[PDB]
Short mmCIF file of C-alpha atoms and ligand atoms in Angstrom, two decimals:
data_model
loop_
_atom_site.label_atom_id
_atom_site.label_comp_id
_atom_site.label_asym_id
_atom_site.label_seq_id
_atom_site.Cartn_x
_atom_site.Cartn_y
_atom_site.Cartn_z
CA UNK A 4 0.00 0.00 0.00
CA UNK A 5 1.13 3.57 -0.79
CA UNK A 6 1.23 6.89 1.06
CA UNK A 7 -1.48 9.24 -0.34
CA UNK A 8 -0.42 12.62 1.20
CA UNK A 9 3.36 13.45 1.44
CA UNK A 10 4.62 13.71 5.06
CA UNK A 11 5.68 17.35 4.50
CA UNK A 12 1.97 18.16 3.87
CA UNK A 13 0.66 16.99 7.25
CA UNK A 14 -0.24 19.50 9.98
CA UNK A 15 -0.77 18.08 13.48
CA UNK A 16 -2.35 20.98 15.35
CA UNK A 17 -3.95 21.74 18.69
CA UNK A 18 -6.13 24.74 19.50
CA UNK A 19 -5.30 26.44 22.87
CA UNK A 20 -7.63 29.01 24.39
CA UNK A 21 -9.13 30.56 27.52
CA UNK A 22 -12.83 29.70 28.18
CA UNK A 23 -14.13 33.08 26.81
CA UNK A 24 -12.08 33.15 23.55
CA UNK A 25 -14.54 30.96 21.55
CA UNK A 26 -12.56 27.72 21.27
CA UNK A 27 -15.59 25.56 20.55
CA UNK A 28 -16.84 27.85 17.76
CA UNK A 29 -13.34 28.21 16.25
CA UNK A 30 -12.89 24.41 16.24
CA UNK A 31 -16.37 23.88 14.76
CA UNK A 32 -15.57 26.36 11.94
CA UNK A 33 -12.18 24.68 11.27
CA UNK A 34 -14.02 21.35 10.90
CA UNK A 35 -16.66 22.95 8.69
CA UNK A 36 -14.25 24.57 6.20
CA UNK A 37 -11.80 21.60 6.18
CA UNK A 38 -14.71 19.17 5.71
CA UNK A 39 -15.71 20.90 2.42
CA UNK A 40 -12.17 21.94 1.32
CA UNK A 41 -12.81 20.89 -2.33
CA UNK A 42 -15.75 23.37 -2.56
CA UNK A 43 -13.75 26.32 -1.13
CA UNK A 44 -13.13 29.01 -3.78
CA UNK A 45 -11.75 32.44 -4.69
CA UNK A 67 -15.54 16.06 20.47
CA UNK A 68 -13.14 13.45 18.98
CA UNK A 69 -9.65 13.17 20.54
CA UNK A 70 -8.34 13.81 17.01
CA UNK A 71 -10.13 14.60 13.75
CA UNK A 72 -8.69 14.11 10.21
CA UNK A 73 -9.40 16.84 7.64
CA UNK A 74 -8.07 18.44 4.44
CA UNK A 75 -7.13 21.92 3.22
CA UNK A 76 -5.90 23.21 -0.15
CA UNK A 77 -6.19 26.94 0.66
CA UNK A 78 -8.96 29.57 0.42
CA UNK A 79 -8.21 29.77 -3.30
CA UNK A 80 -7.08 26.17 -3.95
CA UNK A 81 -3.55 27.66 -4.05
CA UNK A 82 -1.80 24.84 -2.23
CA UNK A 83 -1.39 21.14 -2.84
CA UNK A 84 -3.78 19.27 -0.58
CA UNK A 85 -2.66 19.20 3.07
CA UNK A 86 -3.84 16.77 5.74
CA UNK A 87 -4.74 18.59 8.96
CA UNK A 88 -5.13 16.54 12.16
CA UNK A 89 -7.05 18.62 14.71
CA UNK A 90 -6.13 17.37 18.18
CA UNK A 91 -8.36 18.16 21.18
CA UNK A 92 -6.21 20.06 23.74
CA UNK A 93 -8.23 21.29 26.84
CA UNK A 99 -0.72 18.73 34.25
CA UNK A 100 0.55 15.56 32.55
CA UNK A 101 -2.43 15.53 30.12
CA UNK A 102 -1.81 19.07 28.83
CA UNK A 103 1.93 18.26 28.54
CA UNK A 104 1.25 14.98 26.67
CA UNK A 105 -0.94 16.88 24.19
CA UNK A 106 2.05 19.19 23.45
CA UNK A 107 3.96 16.10 22.26
CA UNK A 108 1.03 14.75 20.19
CA UNK A 109 0.54 17.99 18.22
CA UNK A 110 3.46 19.51 16.27
CA UNK A 111 2.16 23.11 16.11
CA UNK A 112 -0.45 25.14 17.92
CA UNK A 113 -3.05 27.78 17.17
CA UNK A 114 -3.40 30.10 20.21
CA UNK A 115 -6.89 31.64 20.29
CA UNK A 116 -7.49 34.94 22.13
CA UNK A 117 -10.53 37.13 22.66
CA UNK A 118 -10.29 40.58 21.03
CA UNK A 119 -11.92 42.11 24.14
CA UNK A 120 -10.42 40.15 27.07
CA UNK A 121 -7.04 39.51 25.47
CA UNK A 122 -4.31 37.71 27.40
CA UNK A 123 -5.73 36.18 30.62
CA UNK A 124 -3.90 34.53 33.58
CA UNK A 125 -4.55 31.00 32.19
CA UNK A 126 -2.95 32.06 28.87
CA UNK A 127 0.37 32.50 30.74
CA UNK A 128 0.33 28.89 32.02
CA UNK A 129 -0.40 27.10 28.70
CA UNK A 130 2.15 29.38 27.00
CA UNK A 131 4.82 27.98 29.32
CA UNK A 132 4.09 24.30 28.56
CA UNK A 133 4.27 25.24 24.87
CA UNK A 134 7.71 26.83 25.38
CA UNK A 135 8.96 23.78 27.34
CA UNK A 136 8.33 21.48 24.34
CA UNK A 137 9.45 24.24 21.89
CA UNK A 138 6.07 24.22 20.07
CA UNK A 139 5.80 26.56 17.03
CA UNK A 140 2.63 28.60 17.02
CA UNK A 141 0.40 31.17 15.37
CA UNK A 142 -2.39 33.17 17.02
CA UNK A 143 -6.00 33.89 16.05
CA UNK A 144 -7.60 36.93 17.72
CA UNK A 145 -11.28 35.97 17.68
CA UNK A 146 -14.43 38.00 18.45
CA UNK A 147 -13.38 41.10 16.48
CA UNK A 148 -17.10 41.95 16.13
CA UNK A 149 -17.75 42.22 19.90
CA UNK A 150 -17.99 45.44 21.90
CA UNK A 151 -14.51 46.47 23.09
CA UNK A 152 -12.57 44.60 20.37
CA UNK A 153 -9.01 45.92 19.97
CA UNK A 154 -6.64 43.80 17.88
CA UNK A 155 -3.38 45.69 18.38
CA UNK A 156 -3.96 45.93 22.15
CA UNK A 157 -4.05 42.10 22.26
CA UNK A 158 -0.92 41.95 20.08
CA UNK A 159 0.87 44.32 22.52
CA UNK A 160 -0.26 42.14 25.47
CA UNK A 161 1.30 39.06 23.83
CA UNK A 162 4.58 40.99 23.94
CA UNK A 163 4.29 42.57 27.40
CA UNK A 164 2.60 39.71 29.30
CA UNK A 165 3.97 36.59 27.56
CA UNK A 166 7.29 37.96 26.20
CA UNK A 167 6.29 36.99 22.65
CA UNK A 168 7.70 38.54 19.49
CA UNK A 169 4.17 38.90 18.06
CA UNK A 170 3.99 39.82 14.37
CA UNK A 171 0.63 40.63 12.76
CA UNK A 172 -0.09 39.04 9.36
CA UNK A 173 -3.25 41.14 9.12
CA UNK A 174 -5.14 44.15 10.36
CA UNK A 175 -8.90 43.90 10.84
CA UNK A 176 -11.27 45.94 8.64
CA UNK A 177 -13.34 47.68 11.31
CA UNK A 178 -14.14 46.48 14.84
CA UNK A 179 -17.22 45.81 17.00
CA UNK A 180 -20.43 46.30 14.91
CA UNK A 181 -18.20 47.78 12.15
CA UNK A 182 -16.06 44.62 11.71
CA UNK A 183 -16.42 43.44 8.07
CA UNK A 184 -13.21 41.58 7.12
CA UNK A 185 -9.41 41.56 7.32
CA UNK A 186 -6.45 42.88 5.32
CA UNK A 187 -3.76 40.40 4.30
CA UNK A 188 -0.69 42.65 4.85
CA UNK A 189 1.60 40.60 2.58
CA UNK A 190 -0.78 40.85 -0.43
CA UNK A 191 -2.03 44.32 0.61
CA UNK A 192 -5.58 43.23 -0.15
CA UNK A 193 -8.74 43.29 1.94
CA UNK A 194 -10.62 39.98 2.13
CA UNK A 195 -14.39 40.33 1.52
CA UNK A 196 -16.04 37.00 2.49
CA UNK A 197 -19.44 36.12 0.96
CA UNK A 198 -22.06 36.09 3.74
CA UNK A 199 -24.62 33.95 1.85
CA UNK A 200 -22.39 30.84 1.49
CA UNK A 201 -20.96 31.11 5.04
CA UNK A 202 -17.68 32.49 3.70
CA UNK A 203 -16.87 29.56 1.40
CA UNK A 204 -15.98 32.15 -1.25
CA UNK A 205 -14.53 35.66 -1.15
CA UNK A 206 -13.05 38.42 -3.28
CA UNK A 207 -9.81 40.37 -2.72
CA UNK A 208 -10.45 44.14 -2.66
CA UNK A 209 -8.20 47.20 -2.42
CA UNK A 210 -7.09 48.23 1.07
CA UNK A 211 -9.53 50.92 2.34
CA UNK A 212 -8.16 54.47 2.14
CA UNK A 213 -8.48 54.99 5.92
CA UNK A 214 -6.29 51.88 6.56
CA UNK A 215 -3.52 52.46 3.96
CA UNK A 216 -1.14 54.19 6.41
CA UNK A 217 -1.61 51.59 9.18
CA UNK A 218 -1.28 48.71 6.69
CA UNK A 219 1.99 50.16 5.30
CA UNK A 220 3.40 50.51 8.83
CA UNK A 221 2.46 46.99 9.90
CA UNK A 222 3.60 45.49 6.57
CA UNK A 223 7.02 47.11 7.11
CA UNK A 224 6.98 45.57 10.62
CA UNK A 225 6.49 42.08 9.16
CA UNK A 226 9.05 42.62 6.37
CA UNK A 227 11.62 43.65 9.03
CA UNK A 228 10.84 40.41 10.89
CA UNK A 229 11.37 38.41 7.69
CA UNK A 230 14.69 40.16 6.92
CA UNK A 231 16.10 38.93 10.26
CA UNK A 232 15.93 35.31 8.99
CA UNK A 233 19.20 35.50 6.96
CA UNK A 234 22.12 37.72 6.04
CA UNK A 235 21.13 37.58 2.35
CA UNK A 236 17.60 38.85 3.11
CA UNK A 237 18.90 41.52 5.53
CA UNK A 238 21.34 42.89 2.90
CA UNK A 239 18.48 43.01 0.35
CA UNK A 240 16.19 44.83 2.82
CA UNK A 241 18.83 47.36 3.95
CA UNK A 242 19.89 47.79 0.31
CA UNK A 243 16.48 49.29 -0.51
CA UNK A 244 15.08 46.38 -2.57
CA UNK A 245 11.65 44.89 -1.87
CA UNK A 246 11.53 41.33 -0.62
CA UNK A 247 9.13 39.20 -2.69
CA UNK A 248 6.05 37.58 -1.16
CA UNK A 249 7.75 34.18 -1.46
CA UNK A 250 10.92 35.48 0.29
CA UNK A 251 8.81 36.98 3.07
CA UNK A 252 6.74 33.84 3.63
CA UNK A 253 9.71 31.43 3.61
CA UNK A 254 11.52 33.66 6.13
CA UNK A 255 8.51 34.00 8.43
CA UNK A 256 7.99 30.20 8.31
CA UNK A 257 11.64 29.65 9.29
CA UNK A 258 11.22 31.97 12.28
CA UNK A 259 7.94 30.40 13.43
CA UNK A 260 9.53 26.93 13.26
CA UNK A 261 12.51 28.18 15.25
CA UNK A 262 10.16 29.53 18.00
CA UNK A 263 11.44 33.08 17.37
CA UNK A 264 8.10 34.72 16.54
CA UNK A 265 4.36 34.18 16.73
CA UNK A 266 2.35 35.27 13.67
CA UNK A 267 -1.05 36.81 14.40
CA UNK A 268 -4.32 36.52 12.48
CA UNK A 269 -7.79 37.70 13.44
CA UNK A 270 -11.49 37.65 12.73
CA UNK A 271 -14.71 36.07 13.90
CA UNK A 272 -15.41 32.36 13.81
CA UNK A 273 -19.15 32.80 14.42
CA UNK A 274 -19.54 35.48 11.73
CA UNK A 275 -17.71 33.26 9.16
CA UNK A 276 -14.91 35.82 8.66
CA UNK A 277 -11.37 34.78 9.61
CA UNK A 278 -10.94 31.07 10.28
CA UNK A 279 -10.51 30.50 6.51
CA UNK A 280 -7.42 32.76 6.33
CA UNK A 281 -6.07 31.30 9.57
CA UNK A 282 -6.20 27.86 7.91
CA UNK A 283 -4.03 29.20 5.08
CA UNK A 284 -1.61 30.36 7.80
CA UNK A 285 -1.56 26.82 9.30
CA UNK A 286 -0.37 25.53 5.92
CA UNK A 287 2.09 28.36 5.27
CA UNK A 288 3.68 28.70 8.69
CA UNK A 289 3.04 25.71 11.04
CA UNK A 290 5.33 22.68 11.05
CA UNK A 291 5.04 19.37 9.29
CA UNK A 292 6.20 16.26 11.22
CA UNK A 293 9.59 16.63 9.47
CA UNK A 294 10.07 20.25 10.75
CA UNK A 295 10.44 19.35 14.41
CA UNK A 296 13.21 17.38 16.12
CA UNK A 297 13.17 13.59 16.09
CA UNK A 298 11.34 12.24 19.15
CA UNK A 299 13.64 11.10 21.97
CA UNK A 300 13.34 7.88 23.98
CA UNK A 301 15.13 5.31 26.15
CA UNK A 302 16.71 2.15 24.70
CA UNK A 303 16.64 -1.24 26.52
CA UNK A 304 20.24 -0.64 27.74
CA UNK A 305 19.17 2.71 29.33
CA UNK A 306 20.98 4.84 26.69
CA UNK A 307 19.04 7.61 24.94
CA UNK A 308 17.71 6.93 21.43
CA UNK A 309 15.66 8.77 18.81
CA UNK A 310 13.18 8.08 16.03
CA UNK A 311 13.08 10.26 12.91
CA UNK A 312 9.89 11.31 11.12
CA UNK A 313 10.25 8.75 8.35
CA UNK A 314 8.31 5.76 6.99
CA UNK A 315 11.65 3.90 6.70
CA UNK A 316 12.49 4.11 10.43
CA UNK A 317 11.30 1.39 12.85
CA UNK A 318 7.69 1.86 14.03
CA UNK A 319 7.20 3.94 17.18
CA UNK A 320 4.09 5.58 18.57
CA UNK A 321 2.51 7.02 21.70
CA UNK A 322 -1.01 6.15 22.92
CA UNK A 323 -2.55 9.45 24.10
CA UNK A 324 -6.30 8.94 24.67
CA UNK A 325 -8.73 6.10 25.42
CA UNK A 326 -12.30 6.83 24.28
CA UNK A 327 -15.28 4.60 25.08
CA UNK A 328 -17.73 3.60 22.33
CA UNK A 329 -20.96 1.63 22.96
CA UNK A 330 -20.85 -0.20 19.59
CA UNK A 331 -17.18 -1.29 19.28
CA UNK A 332 -15.56 -0.74 22.71
CA UNK A 333 -12.47 1.29 23.56
CA UNK A 334 -10.82 3.44 20.89
CA UNK A 335 -7.11 3.82 21.69
CA UNK A 336 -5.87 7.02 19.98
CA UNK A 337 -2.19 6.96 18.99
CA UNK A 338 0.33 9.25 17.27
CA UNK A 339 2.85 7.57 14.99
CA UNK A 340 6.31 9.16 15.14
CA UNK A 341 8.18 6.81 12.83
CA UNK A 342 7.71 3.83 10.52
CA UNK A 343 4.41 2.22 9.61
CA UNK A 344 1.78 0.03 11.25
CA UNK A 345 -0.73 -2.17 9.42
CA UNK A 346 -3.89 -3.98 10.61
CA UNK A 347 -2.77 -7.52 11.50
CA UNK A 348 0.70 -6.44 12.76
CA UNK A 349 1.93 -7.55 16.18
CA UNK A 350 3.94 -4.85 17.99
CA UNK A 351 5.50 -4.26 21.42
CA UNK A 352 4.11 -2.20 24.28
CA UNK A 353 7.63 -1.33 25.49
CA UNK A 354 6.49 0.18 28.81
CA UNK A 355 4.47 -2.93 29.78
CA UNK A 356 6.67 -5.52 28.01
CA UNK A 357 3.62 -7.18 26.42
CA UNK A 358 2.83 -7.70 22.74
CA UNK A 359 -0.28 -6.24 21.09
CA UNK A 360 -1.84 -7.19 17.74
CA UNK A 361 -3.63 -4.46 15.80
CA UNK A 362 -7.06 -5.28 14.35
CA UNK A 363 -9.46 -2.56 13.16
CA UNK A 364 -8.05 0.99 12.83
CA UNK A 365 -10.17 4.09 12.23
CA UNK A 366 -9.84 7.84 11.71
CA UNK A 367 -12.53 10.31 12.71
CA UNK A 368 -13.61 12.94 10.14
CA UNK A 369 -15.97 15.84 10.84
CA UNK A 370 -19.21 13.99 9.95
CA UNK A 371 -18.20 10.31 9.63
CA UNK A 372 -15.75 7.60 10.64
CA UNK A 373 -13.34 6.11 8.13
CA UNK A 374 -11.97 2.57 8.25
CA UNK A 375 -8.23 2.34 7.37
CA UNK A 376 -5.64 -0.44 7.07
CA UNK A 377 -2.40 1.38 7.85
CA UNK A 378 -1.02 4.41 9.69
CA UNK A 379 2.31 6.03 8.83
CA UNK A 380 4.85 8.37 10.43
CA UNK A 381 3.36 11.74 11.34
CA UNK A 382 -0.25 10.53 11.36
CA UNK A 383 -2.84 9.85 14.09
CA UNK A 384 -5.57 7.22 14.32
CA UNK A 385 -7.48 5.04 16.79
CA UNK A 386 -7.23 1.25 17.27
CA UNK A 387 -10.20 -0.91 18.22
CA UNK A 388 -9.90 -3.87 20.62
CA UNK A 389 -6.39 -3.43 22.07
CA UNK A 390 -5.95 -5.60 25.17
CA UNK A 391 -3.90 -3.58 27.70
CA UNK A 392 -2.74 -0.16 26.56
CA UNK A 393 -2.57 2.79 28.94
CA UNK A 394 -2.30 6.43 27.91
CA UNK A 395 1.44 7.24 27.84
CA UNK A 396 2.46 3.78 26.63
CA UNK A 397 4.77 3.44 23.66
CA UNK A 398 3.79 0.92 20.97
CA UNK A 399 6.83 0.13 18.84
CA UNK A 400 8.66 -2.35 16.63
CA UNK A 401 9.55 -5.62 18.37
CA UNK A 402 12.97 -5.66 16.65
CA UNK A 403 13.71 -2.01 17.61
CA UNK A 404 12.29 -1.40 21.11
CA UNK A 405 12.24 2.08 22.66
CA UNK A 406 10.29 3.91 25.39
CA UNK A 407 9.23 7.39 24.21
CA UNK A 408 7.43 8.52 27.42
CL1 CL B 1 -20.94 42.76 21.56
#
């Protein structure tokens, strides 16, 4: 059997937010747009979905949306590869934001932010951006400026393209048109675009010399540079909008593709070998199989669903593997992946992907399931 989506096109993401930021609505919109990704045009532990861009401008990407509400929150940081930090445009950075931010830094998790609720009374995008800097110590770089705020919120400006995004209300924002930046925003957009170009220029000596030399960096140069810096945990890119009003999540999904890491963009997972020496497993189908079980869900029709993240190699239905923590063998039977509106039966799971096994005999959350001939304990 063959791999259908290249590993570099996977995005394992978790959504982190305070209770009042609109996490449930943001997640529901992500699942809505990524469930109809081929029609887009110019409670599961993990849900499989697809995205090819608001304008079908990217090859198809596989997005795994991982539910991420001490050890549990830290395990989730190892299951996802990148995070989307959701903040309220009114409330901004809360005390609980400071705590989750620290777990994210501990596991060096690249992230972008989505400032939601731009249509609510008291919305102030740049105030939230400034709070990310002053309260969390983040080098927060806006990718956009909102068009209006509160009852006047109508869209967002993509600072790189210098175009306003006008989403179609009738089709729930499945389609949109790019418009000229409004005259009353031109000055602010120029200032904030220069801010993001400066951030891009810091990525390499070649780009810095071009920037200081008076030449304009291209959109491709800017995006590659910003991606490098996000992956290196140097900056957090900021998007905004309203999930409920169908204006913003779509552009944030483009940002997930453009700036968040693939399984191959983060360091190889570390573990302990049988002889007590440290080992590692690279994000490759050719490496020996290794995975971490991260959630056990009950189901009244088939029994326990053991959710696992594969870090290396491949596992097929029928394979017998080792639970290295328990020193017991397990044989995989039925494997499934949850989509937004249905469950899909699959026969194999490869490096960088997530799925759930049915009928495993004795697997605890935190257990490593790996190759018998190449044992390792990841957690
Ligand atoms: Cl309001």
